[PDB]
């Protein structure tokens, strides 16, 4: 069995590298922004024996700014470097945002009569939709167990992008879209709330001032899903949550009381979000109630008939 596994493992690693190399070669040959003279040179060195991950990264993936394949390379190489990983995530998000904005612009010109730039093939997804498509494609290929998904660093960055680029209600997007994304991808509920707590305590920009209203809304949505999950898992077994989650919702209520007060005394006139915040207060209290009941004994009596 040992000799079998060692060969199955060598073939699995070399197959992972080979697919990366094939994805690169195909993309480079098809890229409009690559001169023909270079493409023939790329085809010579990549359509043959499998190359090392260093070369694939330095000589090709990094030169062409294929940041998604850079991340797959950091995964195949067991690359321990959080800072470079996050730099690559930041470049991939920004590159995709600019590409989505460009395609929506070209569209708006068609729907208005103008002419596109020469050699531009004529309702493309909003930028936050194309961005999260990129995150999904990588996650399914790396399985979320990778070091290219440090949720403690990657979730705040994605939330930062949503704020600093208005990927919120103004354009008709769900303001909780970053949370939906990572939950559906299979991030455990406890880890989400744990990170969101750290976002709220440290107050790193842009998560500052009255925009912590949005952080509280994410916490509300995450805890809500967590409660639903626990209730579902209890019914499941008929046929972890600590007091820290309750404390976190209390502080969240205090943040909302602070934001509303500051909003009422702003220069130029009171803030327009008065009832929007009053609603969030009710939701947060409802969640603290549910969490308090579960913590107080209703969680050990979930498999029992009522």
């Amino acid at each position: 069995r040992q000799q079998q596994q060692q060969l199955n493992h060598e073939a699995s690693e070399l197959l992972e590298i080979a697919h990366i190399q094939d994805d690169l070669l195909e993309r480079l040959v098809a890229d409009p922004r690559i001169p023909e003279e270079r493409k023939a040179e790329i085809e010579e060195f990549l359509d043959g024996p499998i190359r090392t991950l260093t070369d694939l990264f330095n000589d090709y993936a990094d030169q062409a700014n294929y940041y998604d394949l850079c991340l797959l390379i950091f995964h195949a190489a067991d690359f321990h470097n959080p800072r470079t990983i996050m730099d690559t995530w930041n470049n991939l998000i920004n590159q995709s945002h600019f590409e989505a904005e460009q395609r929506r612009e070209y569209w708006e010109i068609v729907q208005a009569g103008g002419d596109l730039p020469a050699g531009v093939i004529a309702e493309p997804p909003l930028p936050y939709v194309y961005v999260s498509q990129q995150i999904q494609l990588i996650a399914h290929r790396t399985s979320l167990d990778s070091l290219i998904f440090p949720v403690n660093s990657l979730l705040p960055v994605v939330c930062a992008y949503a704020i600093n680029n208005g990927q919120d209600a103004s354009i008709g997007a769900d303001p909780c879209w970053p949370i939906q994304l990572f939950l559906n991808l299979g991030v455990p509920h406890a880890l989400m709330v744990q990170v969101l707590e750290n976002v709220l305590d440290t107050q790193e920009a842009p998560f500052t001032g009255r925009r912590r209203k949005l952080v509280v809304q994410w916490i509300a949505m995450a805890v809500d899903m967590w409660v639903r999950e626990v209730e579902r898992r209890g019914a499941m077994a008929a046929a972890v949550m600590g007091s820290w989650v309750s404390e976190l919702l209390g502080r969240a209520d205090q943040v909302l009381t602070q934001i509303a007060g500051t909003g009422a005394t702003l220069r130029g006139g009171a803030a327009s979000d008065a009832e929007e915040i009053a609603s969030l207060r009710r939701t947060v209290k409802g969640l603290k109630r549910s969490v308090d009941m579960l913590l107080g004994g209703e969680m050990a009596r979930m498999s029992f008939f009522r």
Binding site: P35, F57, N58, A64
Partner: peptide
């Protein structure tokens, strides 16, 4: 085994020779 070396590469956007 990966080793990044931004120093000396080959200009991916320039022909050879």
């Amino acid at each position: 085994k990966l080793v990044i070396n931004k120093d000396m590469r080959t200009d991916l956007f320039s022909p050879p020779n």
